[PDB]
Structures are given as structure tokens and as C-alpha cells.
Design a protein around this ligand. Structure first.
Ligand code: NA
Length: 223
């Protein structure tokens, strides 16, 4: 039978354990692929000095698997950040935030010395953009941010009924042409009322572990 998507996620998560140094502070992403990774890291027996969480769920699983959790404010930096992606291109630039956590994810990534992305094969794309782009905005700026995103060219859609970790809203933007991921990352963030967007170009991954039918493939940015 074909390997299921969950099995592909587990393949990538299990391989990523090998990338985690012992006795260091590390950062932990969010999502279903990460949830398999937290379990695998706990089962490995590796000594972890402390882990910084990016979501309520990730923090709960770290505790379930006996991995010590620390606030980002307690450390001067992290040795490695491990996280998933909704899309990842050949330069290892990513679209993130399908699960609502892109603000905390980018904060923790930006404090880390290395970013390991874990994903099943379906996330690896030639061009970023098909997956709608999450944008976090404060509630009173919803209509304003939406007009500004529409003027940029995308179709803004409020994520109905959703409240982010820090109490804000997400507008998901459909149909963007992303010529230059770093330029668009910065231009969207210049909209007043936007707190963060899901383009990870400045914080592109350093290495990608991709779960495929042939096992876990290790992929560095294209030359
Ligand atoms: Na997310």
C-alpha cells in the first residue's frame, strides 16, 4: 500500500531527532508533524536543557513527554528550532501559519541558530503561493488591513471565529503572486495593524527533512 500522509510525517519527525543537540536550549514549532516529533524526541532519551514552545498544544505535549519547558525570555538564544511548513520551496523559504501560530513561530525561529523544517512530501513546492497566506492583525484593524492586502492584489478572507494566541485575528490572503518572498514578507509587515505574516523568507529553513516513499530525504537550499 501507499505510505499514508501520517506515516510520511512520522518518517520526517523521527529523522529530525538526530539533528537535536543534547544539553542545549531548543525551540519547538507547532502542528501535526511537530506533534509526532515531540513524541519521538521524548522517546529518544536525549537530555534537553530546555525547550521554548510556540503554542499551547506544543507546550502541553512537551510536558506530556517530560521535556522541560522554559520561557524564551529566560535564554539568550536557541541552538536549533524545529518546525513544519504549509509550503516549502527549493530555497527552503516557507509559508506557515495554517494552524494559527505563525507569530510565535517566527519569534522563536528568529532567536535560533539553525532552523530544521520537517514535512511530508506534499509540502515541497516549486513556487510558494497556492496555500493561502496567513496574516495576523489586531481586531480594530481588520477592515483596514483587508483593504491594504486587496490593493496589493490578494483576496483577503477573515479566519471566521478564530482568535490567535495573543488575542488577535487572522486574515488569510488568497491568490497572491509571490515573485520575491522577502520583499513581500517586508511589504505586508509595513501595513499598520499587521503584527506578522506567514512568509518565512528572512527565517528560511537551513535544512529540510522530507518524508517520502523512499524514506526521509535531507534537503539543503538549492544552489
Ligand atoms: Na501554524
Amino acid at each position: 500500500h501507499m505510505t499514508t500522509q501520517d506515516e510520511l510525517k512520522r518518517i520526517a519527525a523521527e529523522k529530525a531527532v538526530e539533528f537535536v543537540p543534547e544539553n542545549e536550549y531548543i525551540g519547538i514549532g507547532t502542528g501535526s508533524t511537530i506533534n509526532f516529533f515531540i513524541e519521538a524526541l521524548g522517546k529518544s532519551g536525549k537530555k534537553i536543557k530546555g525547550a521554548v514552545s510556540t503554542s499551547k498544544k506544543s507546550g502541553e505535549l512537551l510536558a506530556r513527554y517530560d521535556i522541560p519547558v522554559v520561557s524564551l525570555n529566560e535564554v539568550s538564544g536557541l541552538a536549533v528550532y524545529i518546525d513544519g511548513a504549509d509550503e516549502v520551496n527549493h530555497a527552503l523559504q516557507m509559508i506557515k501559519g495554517g494552524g494559527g501560530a505563525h507569530l510565535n513561530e517566527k519569534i522563536v525561529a528568529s532567536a535560533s541558530e539553525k532552523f530544521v523544517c520537517i514535512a511530508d512530501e506534499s509540502k515541497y513546492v516549486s513556487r510558494l503561493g497556492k496555500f493561502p497566506l496567513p496574516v495576523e492583525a489586531v481586531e480594530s484593524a481588520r477592515s483596514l488591513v483587508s483593504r491594504k492586502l486587496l490593493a496589493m492584489g490578494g483576496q483577503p478572507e477573515l479566519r471566521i471565529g478564530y482568535t490567535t494566541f495573543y488575542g488577535n485575528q487572522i486574515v488569510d490572503v488568497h491568490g497572491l503572486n509571490i515573485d520575491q518572498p522577502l520583499t513581500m514578507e517586508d511589504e505586508i509587515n509595513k501595513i499598520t495593524g499587521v503584527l506578522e505574516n506567514g512568509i518565512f523568507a528572512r527565517d528560511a529553513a537551513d535544512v529540510l527533512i522530507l518524508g517520502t516513499e523512499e524514506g526521509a530525504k535531507v534537503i539543503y537550499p538549492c544552489q
